[PDB]
Design a protein around this nucleic acid. Sequence first.
RNA 1: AGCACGGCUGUAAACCGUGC
RNA 2: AGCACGGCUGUAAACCGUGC
Lengths: 390, 390, 381, 381
Amino acid sequence: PRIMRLVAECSRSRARAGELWLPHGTVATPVFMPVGTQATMKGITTEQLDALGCRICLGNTYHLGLRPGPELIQKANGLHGFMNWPHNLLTDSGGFQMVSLVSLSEVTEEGVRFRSPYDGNETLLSPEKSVQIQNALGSDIIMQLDDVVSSTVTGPRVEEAMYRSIRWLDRCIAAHQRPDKQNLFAIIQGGLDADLRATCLEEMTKRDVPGFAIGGLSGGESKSQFWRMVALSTSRLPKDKPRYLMGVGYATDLVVCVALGCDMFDCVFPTRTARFGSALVPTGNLQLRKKVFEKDFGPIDPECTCPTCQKHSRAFLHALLHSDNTAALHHLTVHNIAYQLQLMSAVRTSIVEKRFPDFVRDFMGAMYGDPTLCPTWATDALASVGITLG
Amino acid sequence: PRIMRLVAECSRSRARAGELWLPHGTVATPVFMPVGTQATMKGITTEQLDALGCRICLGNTYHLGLRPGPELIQKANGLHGFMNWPHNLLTDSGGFQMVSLVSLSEVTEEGVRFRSPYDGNETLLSPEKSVQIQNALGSDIIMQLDDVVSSTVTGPRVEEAMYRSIRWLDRCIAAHQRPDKQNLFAIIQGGLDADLRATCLEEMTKRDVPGFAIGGLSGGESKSQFWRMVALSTSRLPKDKPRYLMGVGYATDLVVCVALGCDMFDCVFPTRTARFGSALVPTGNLQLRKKVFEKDFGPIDPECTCPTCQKHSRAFLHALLHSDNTAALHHLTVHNIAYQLQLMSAVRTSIVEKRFPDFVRDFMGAMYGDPTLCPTWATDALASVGITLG
Amino acid sequence: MKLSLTKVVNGCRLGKIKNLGKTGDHTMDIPGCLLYTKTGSAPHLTHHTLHNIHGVPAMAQLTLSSLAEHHEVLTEYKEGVGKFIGMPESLLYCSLHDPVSPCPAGYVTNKSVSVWSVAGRVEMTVSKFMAIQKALQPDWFQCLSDGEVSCKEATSIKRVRKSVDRSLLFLDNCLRLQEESEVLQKSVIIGVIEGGDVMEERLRSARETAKRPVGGFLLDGFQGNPTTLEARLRLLSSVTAELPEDKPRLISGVSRPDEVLECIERGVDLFESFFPYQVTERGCALTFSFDYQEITSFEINLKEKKYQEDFNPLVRGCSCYCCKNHTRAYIHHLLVTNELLAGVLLMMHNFEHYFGFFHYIREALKSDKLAQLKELIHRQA
Amino acid sequence: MKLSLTKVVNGCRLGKIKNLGKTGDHTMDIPGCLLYTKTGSAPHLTHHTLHNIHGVPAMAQLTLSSLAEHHEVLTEYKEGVGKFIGMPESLLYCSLHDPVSPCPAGYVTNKSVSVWSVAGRVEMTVSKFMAIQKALQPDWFQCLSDGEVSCKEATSIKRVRKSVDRSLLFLDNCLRLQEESEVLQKSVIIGVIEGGDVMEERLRSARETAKRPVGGFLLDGFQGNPTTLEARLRLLSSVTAELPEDKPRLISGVSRPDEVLECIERGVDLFESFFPYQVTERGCALTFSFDYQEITSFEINLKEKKYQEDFNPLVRGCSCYCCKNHTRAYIHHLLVTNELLAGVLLMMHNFEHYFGFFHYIREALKSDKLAQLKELIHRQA
RNA sequence: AGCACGGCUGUAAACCGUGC
RNA sequence: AGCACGGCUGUAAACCGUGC
Ligand SMILES: Nc1nc2cc[nH]c2c(=O)[nH]1
Ligand SMILES: Nc1nc2cc[nH]c2c(=O)[nH]1
Ligand SMILES: [Zn+2]
Ligand SMILES: [Zn+2]
Ligand SMILES: [Zn+2]
Ligand SMILES: [Zn+2]
């Protein structure tokens, strides 16, 4: 049983277009997946997400496990029912929290012990518990709990976490009580070490999990290394199965990683950047809090179809952002999710129409002024799979 | 029965020193009487007044008649009990209110109809009612309700009010049910007309009321006229009975009117000036709200014995007046009442010691810099009773 | 603008205002309320979320407090605030102050009243005020006025008098400035009845204002703590008596359902809808029945643990987005975890419930079943 | 300064602080309170009226909010604030903020905290703060600190952290500045425990502050609405555990009798007496029993008509000036007619009653009858 | 609000004008 | 607070630094 149906393939590169057949409907790939952690898209109603044509978004086991609690969500007809989302849900294990909550994190082979400074009460996250929570939530795609170490750290730490992940994966595969309804995905935690990542690639692919994710790459790792570890991972991952890169949602990152064979992505960046008063455009971003956009009476992006860009000017948003009205934040959240979706949908179309390389050059001319001013890292990444920019 | 015992008499002038024998203790004269209208000295406790050595202060029938009501005060052991004042109380009829509340005042022979803008509910003040209220309050000295016209107005109005007063006086004398305990006083409402005032003097003195007051002179009448109408009144009033001038409490006014034969005075000026951030000194006043008194570390008056001048500097008061603390106002109220009392007590002493004329010259040198810069009006007033100033 | 009365039950005026807003006609019902806004957006809500609400009022209230800072910007836009804020379909009333926060007070002088913004005190002279109105181009605007009476408690009768005289002086100056400008002609000016708690000055204010060619009247300074109202409630009816009936009566700072009903009894027509906002902000939902800083009786508090596992909608049968699509348990989570969706969903329902309340007032008035409504409203939670 | 404990019942510290105030000794009792003042005078009261009160506390609280504006003046007086304000017989604690109004918050920066005055925001750098302290010459002063946590509700754990770090940085800078000046040597500095609702940062704050040679500790940010306290009440006891016992514990914004008792249970020693002031200001009188913005349960409201004809004293047996010399009926009149004597008489009794309350706490503690006191306090009116 | 002037005569007065 | 910079990569983030 294969959950992804391949459609088209840019001959020059590794860029792939396809569909994920999930219990809650088909999802076109490549796909960007907005991250709403506590069963909410951080200011927008499920209707607003439904309208932006999003077919899959994320929840996070750690947060949702603590509050509101797995039992409550079960009584609530699952995460689906709770947040009234008709379409597919993917759930992170709680692995990432290790990096972000490194301070509160204690690691044993048994699991991850998490404390919160506010409340003494603590939580162990054993693979089994992570799975139990995910099974209750009823997310279409669930994720293995992995020993996630930050990309910046070096030591036997990287190696220890890499192997632990493998054992944790098996325990998760063991823990799954709902394969019929939910698809467990493995995460390649090799760090920035080629050999470790490679070794992780080998052993993990040996398990019969529906999809594979690439983890450990969400940090401030050198860009040259970032793309290489992506390339290494994709080059060894089953082609007939998804490649999900986690913690990536920047445009140039997204374009390039599709060309490096990636199929799925999640990032909190679009939704956060919005709550911080930045609005994503083809030419980077617009800091709308800044005074320049005071008499700018045009939309964020004339070419955007999202509701914000249909009815609102940059000027009005700039004034509304200085207000106490939370509405400003919502207008940006809406648009930012729209931009990412418009980008991903635009990319998929270009793969299907055998002009993905052309698309990329058009993109780079927008973002960097020219394919000329493109960052070397992206230039290297693209050339490695046979895309140059004039 | 004579309520005032005369003691001494400046031969040159009409200045008199004496004592009032009242049910609540002896009162030295000349006397200044602080005005607390609603059964309160506007920020100071009865103990604080007791300490300043005040033996007589006023209440006002109009205000107290409306609130809290005569019945309540009767149940309260009288105005005495209510405000816990051991010493003598004098009560204005409600006559003055005619001038101040001219807007809300309608006059018939029957009485004065008073309305308040806030509440439709109205009050008639017939002499009888004024007396009834006063009898309930139990003030040692009560006052006749008189038709009070302002000094500024001219017309048959002056004459009509003057005669009405006479009839009102008789009705009040009639209304009195408590001569044993309370002493009714007549008020000479002649206006600035010599003949009318004179005629009022004649007929009113024909009644056997314990004391006589001089009314109608509290306005902005020319100073030359002010003192002349005082002089006219005193020159024809029984010497063996008190002369109470009403609505006067300025220093130069008080000194001069004692020399013109006056024995009693009331004024709201000291207590109000205090609530307005002005502090009375021998040399006029100190506007302590003003920034000049910011680094002035001396008392209001080094020679004052009042608690304010013992423990507080001008600087601290200046800072406290800008505060939200009401304490600033109380310090000034205390001192201002003290100044007036110290002045009146000082004056009486000088009459007894046959150096009242010397006292007056010392006073004028303080107030005006010299008897030289004295206002002509006071110069005229003083010379008419044989006091020149070098 | 023409006001026509369908009926007058007790003292309650039921009708429509037909030729409203310059462009053709916009039928607005009385008694009724006004969409409460902050910086021209309804609080928490985008157009999507706003239009997701049944029974949105035709007119929307905005305030100089938020808009004045951007006088310059609006002057440059040259097309008026409705279009700027993306509410072109709406009639707009510009009030001087935000009702939720009327604390600062203007520091009124003979020559200047001052609204309070993010920038700070904005000193508006009459000319500047009328300049701002040119930039904004609202349907209605409250005339520059002195409403400080209510703020302080001293109410010196001479102060109360100045409030009336100042307000009348501002009115007459603004009227002339409107005469001169063609654009301003198109805007309707609202006179402000004042006078505080002094009956005499209230009646004086009412008559003199009525003497002017104003389109309607604002009843200022009745805004008060809940207990105080019953007192000023008499003064209210005194005042409305002095106003012509063919002109609509606005009141500021009155949005509580109970107080609302009573003001309608005393012939008040239009209300601010800031109460639902305040409810939203304290994590509470309107639950009181109408169908036929302290947390009030009209609402429940979804922060409470009783609701952690309560899988009913906020109010059974409520056709709003939230009740139809979500549960109390869900809102409880949203509030507890401090998520912005709590506010959006609460605002949506709180508005819809409040808007439904007004619909049932007008309906009650047609059947003289208003007294029964009064009682049903005072039902707890 | 030396603190000696007579006893420790439950968690409650009964004792005296003996060598206080530089000039010889001034025995101050724990647990106890501090005369609340506005601009260095007790509110409404002159010396006469103040000394007319039995059981006036030895120490009096003043605040930079009122005094700082006059830094210049006090610098010129050269003799310190006690003598300036005519309270030379009193020990003086200088707090940064007035507890009744802690709304503005300082706009704290790494280099500046700002109190709020009549003039406006007063930006005090550490040097300026310590300069002001030189001018004032108090017995105790709260060190410049960041207490904004409580004001906002966001409590970003990174913000909470900054509150602690900032407070510690201020403490260390001020300590050095004190080292340099002889005058300042004579003043005792109070460290401010912080950390908001984050347990970890609270303990961190407690320990690091204790590491410094401070004379005592201020427990900041527990100041809260009445419901909130019970929650932060646990955090309180956690913190006091980390403080040495030979140093006194002050808390800000806690003056309600009920909350007071509880904080004593958690080993807090000194309290502000602003509650009696607030009671005074709303025309209410403390009536709750101890002998053995909403109006609270501890008080009656003398504005009410039930008291127009009530010729009993405020509280039978109360030896204060007002109860002994006047009746409720009289106070009622004073309030109704808006006379300043209302405030003076209310303040006097409210203070005396509150001061009596503390006397009975210490007395209860000696006989371990405190639990009974708790119950007697919660008696209504 | 706050600041500065000018005003206070048995208290519609912790106030009232006039600026900013 | 507010303003200006700099920061945001499966959310200790309507945020965090740094000034004023
Ligand atoms: N579980 C998990 N989530 C994320 C999100 C970004 N990177 C990772 C990772 O390595 N593991
Ligand atoms: N009754 C009364 N009182 C006053 C107070 C000042 N003048 C007068 C007066 O003429 N009559
Ligand atoms: Zn858009
Ligand atoms: Zn003195
Ligand atoms: Zn609803
Ligand atoms: Zn008492």
